[PDB]
Design a protein around this ligand. Structure first.
Ligand SMILES: Nc1nc2c(ncn2[C@@H]2O[C@H](COP(=O)(O)OP(=O)(O)O)[C@@H](O)[C@H]2O)c(=O)[nH]1
Ligand SMILES: [Mg+2]
Length: 388
């Protein structure tokens, strides 16, 4: 297994996302080996349902000389919003498709802003439909506009790879600069510009607490899934969230009928904690390497509000709405502040909001959450920025 990289095509409708996706898959198959996909196979995106939220996504796979890519393409504007806000497709990089004829358009800007909000780490640009523009100064002008638009949202527009091509020429089997060579140039940009994502085992240790036990003859044990890093018996951990942060030592690690020396990312296990009582640990707190994650009550978020068809509200909510925010394992009530001038949010919409929780939660930007009322999911969010 070589590097596996998650990517996707973003950009305004009709700018050439599905055509480019089909061209990449077909040309990589012909060049490096794999399966070719045509336009109709990718334009028809299957439906996959998870928590009532319906997202239509097309998934294609293709190989570079050294990597295997998983690529997502979406039919509608709402599909891209839901896919990016939730953790459905965790893109390691996004391919921004922009038509050289019309230039950046409203959904071009929204998709860059969304990528910033949800934490898309890198963006590569395919400047498409260059077969329709013969003036190279006009191509330069639109490229400059795309780079500046990227920098407006804190992406490094001056260093961004911008590949000029015609996804339709490439899919049709054309040669020349805008044909197959341009799609191979884009694949070479994916290989050179997007690093392999850091392994969970290499990150700082983090384990959300799911259950707590007072075991007679042993002491206090917390159970959960290790999300990141490694914890060894004898090392210190912080208990972060809900209550003031405290620090203790791990004195044991175990799985069912298996005593362990350490707990590793992906493992579900129990952790024995020195000098701790059951009332000091609780669900919704996390164990973490000391000093690597901080509790917060205030944060900004990007939020998709479920439509009534997805089991959400069928009425708008107002500024000052106080639902529950479900973080990892538990609900915390929080008050919502909308952008200035915004008084209500419609179901089916996505908005940027500020939140103040009634108790702190350990969080970094990129943490996903659900918004619930009465235990019914009414929204999905991602922490865009922690307020301090
Ligand atoms: N002339 C030209 N047309 C293109 C190119 N790429 C896509 N198109 C056309 O633009 C229309 C929309 O393309 P599509 O891939 O469905 O755009 P999407 O909405 O972003 O997925 C289709 O009619 C394509 O054939 C190109 O490089 N040159
Ligand atoms: Mg499409």
């Amino acid at each position: 297994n070589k590097p596996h990289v998650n990517v996707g095509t973003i950009g305004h409708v009709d700018h050439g996302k599905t055509t480019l996706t089909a061209a990449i898959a077909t040309i990589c198959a012909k060049t490096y080996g794999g399966e070719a996909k045509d336009y109709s196979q990718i334009d028809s995106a299957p439906e996959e349902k998870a928590r009532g939220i319906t997202i239509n996504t097309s998934h294609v796979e293709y190989d570079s000389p050294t990597r295997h890519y998983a690529h997502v393409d979406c039919p509608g504007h709402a599909d891209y919003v839901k896919n990016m806000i939730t953790g459905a497709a965790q893109m390691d990089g996004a391919i921004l498709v922009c038509a050289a004829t019309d230039g950046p358009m409203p959904q071009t800007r929204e998709h860059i802003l969304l990528s910033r909000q949800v934490g898309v780490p890198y963006i590569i640009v395919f400047l498409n439909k260059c077969d329709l523009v013969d003036d190279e100064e006009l191509l330069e002008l639109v490229e400059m506009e795309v780079r500046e638009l990227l920098s407006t949202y804190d992406f490094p527009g001056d260093d961004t790879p911008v590949i000029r091509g015609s996804a339709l020429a490439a899919l049709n089997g054309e040669a020349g600069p805008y044909g197959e060579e341009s799609v191979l140039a884009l694949v070479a940009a994916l290989d050179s510009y997007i690093p392999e994502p850091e392994r969970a085992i290499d990150k700082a240790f983090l384990m959300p607490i799911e259950d707590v036990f007072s075991i007679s003859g042993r002491g206090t044990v917390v159970t959960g899934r290790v999300e990141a890093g490694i914890i060894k018996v004898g090392e210190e951990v912080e208990i972060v969230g809900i209550k003031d942060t405290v620090k203790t030592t791990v004195t044991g690690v175990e799985m069912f009928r298996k005593l362990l020396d350490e707990g590793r990312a992906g493992e579900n296990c129990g952790i024995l904690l020195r000098g701790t009582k059951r009332e000091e640990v609780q669900r919704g707190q996390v164990l973490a390497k000391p000093g690597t994650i901080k509790p917060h009550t205030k944060f900004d978020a990007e939020v998709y509000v479920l439509s009534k068809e997805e089991g959400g509200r069928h009425t708008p909510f107002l500024n000052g709405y106080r639902p529950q925010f479900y973080f990892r394992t538990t609900d915390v009530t929080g008050a919502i502040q909308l952008k200035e001038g915004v008084e209500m949010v419609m179901p089916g919409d996505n908005v940027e909001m500020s939140v103040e929780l009634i108790h702190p939660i350990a969080m970094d930007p990129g943490l996903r959450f659900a918004i619930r009322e009465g235990g019914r999911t009414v929204g999905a969010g991602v922490v865009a920025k922690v307020t301090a």
